[PDB]
From a paper:
Despite high sequence variations, biophysical characterization uncovered that both variants possess very similar glycan binding preferences, although very surprisingly LecBPA14 generally displays 2- to 7-fold higher affinities.
LecBPA14 was cloned, recombinantly expressed and purified from E. coli. In analogy to LecBPAO1,41 the 1.70 Å resolution native structure of LecBPA14 shows the lectin as homotetramer with the four carbohydrate recognition domains (CRD) containing two Ca2+-ions each located on the vertices of a pseudotetrahedron. Notably, the structural alignment of LecBPA14 and LecBPAO1 revealed that all amino acid variations in LecBPA14 are located exclusively on the outer surface of the tetramer. Mutations at the interfaces of the tetramer subunits are not present, and thus the oligomerization of [name] is conserved.
Author numbering:
A (entry chain A), B (entry chain B), C (entry chain D), D (entry chain C): 1 to 114
């Protein structure tokens, strides 16, 4: 299945935060309605935050996360979870090698804000 | 139900990150096997990160999040989600008032690291 | 927090299924836009299905689960999870006594159908 | 990523329930520790239950779901969610064709029982 794609409500503010856990330098691209609106880059084997931003989901509400290491696409896993019928998490893990920890870059998207 | 309590694997490294979305100043306490091992305080209505740390789950693996505003306990909601049978997220929302957005402090715990 | 309340897309077919794991006879009440549309009753300590129905979410899309045993309200826990940005589960556990297993009646709501 | 594989606690009773939403006859295979312990075969475009069984997770706790239609593997998606730090759902969707609804066979694994 396609992974890392989420439909948000339209024109809604959301937070996107990325953590790194790999020897490889991670590149996280955030696309909103098929336009790149953020790129995070960093390296950590200790969960360092390599980016955190507030973005808007725009008309289509389509938010896609892509992760690469040195231009090679990582394999993704994802889900969305909603708590108390209001608090949304869109969760992505990525795998840049063979160990299947899926934590090489971890991306957490949350809404609503404010 | 009790919320904000999670059983991790023993002696395991995990990340904890807290976000704020309220007029009220948020205090997030992190307890590992009933000892307070981190405390984050901060105020934001725009999802600012008010703390991020790497901790060890210790022998019991018990991780509890408590949130308060002005010394008053916030109501919590929580769940744990596992992706690819390996990547774990323990998720907490908290409500300090009456609107029920449960985002006033948002806490994300992730493991494994490295 | 209020639990057992979910917002579905409007005018959408959904499935609701209830399982029992208790000595007590479970009564599961299903409301759609604040009107009772189903009631499932049954007893099992071995996960027997006590009801499965297809319903429509109507204009408001509001679905609520309540659980009681001999007229006494059970404590609820719930969450919604979305897979592949399309497959939805709305999940309820309920606790009729003291052991905190939350499985006394378990309710799974799924959409889309067809 | 591999999907439809879950680690349960050892020697634990669990329920497995399959729903069908396709024109195609669905064959759901359940393995516990790499041995077939159940096979559900049925057809429905309206969420009918094509199998429900109680099984034991055995020493390894490994549970795998595979879905096929006329001998051809469906694409799977999955996740595990834990409520109240005790109530577990392991969730599978499967796609037998092109529409990406992932509901053609839907598998819900729950524990604990009793
Ligand atoms: Ca890896
Ligand atoms: Ca890693
Ligand atoms: Ca609030
Ligand atoms: Ca708020
Ligand atoms: Ca109970
Ligand atoms: Ca029970
Ligand atoms: Ca399909
Ligand atoms: Ca279908």
């Amino acid at each position: 299945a396609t992974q890392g794609v989420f439909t948000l409500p339209a024109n809604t503010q959301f937070g996107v935060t990325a953590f790194a856990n790999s020897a490889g330098t991670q590149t996280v691209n955030v696309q909103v309605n098929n336009e790149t609106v953020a790129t995070f880059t960093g390296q950590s084997t200790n969960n360092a935050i390599i980016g955190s931003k507030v973005l808007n989901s725009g008309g289509g509400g389509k938010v896609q996360i892509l992760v690469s290491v040195n231009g090679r696409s990582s394999d993704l896993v994802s889900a969305q979870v909603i708590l108390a019928n209001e608090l949304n998490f869109a969760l992505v893990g990525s795998e840049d090698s063979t160990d299947n920890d899926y934590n090489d870059a971890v991306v957490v998207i949350n809404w609503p804000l404010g």
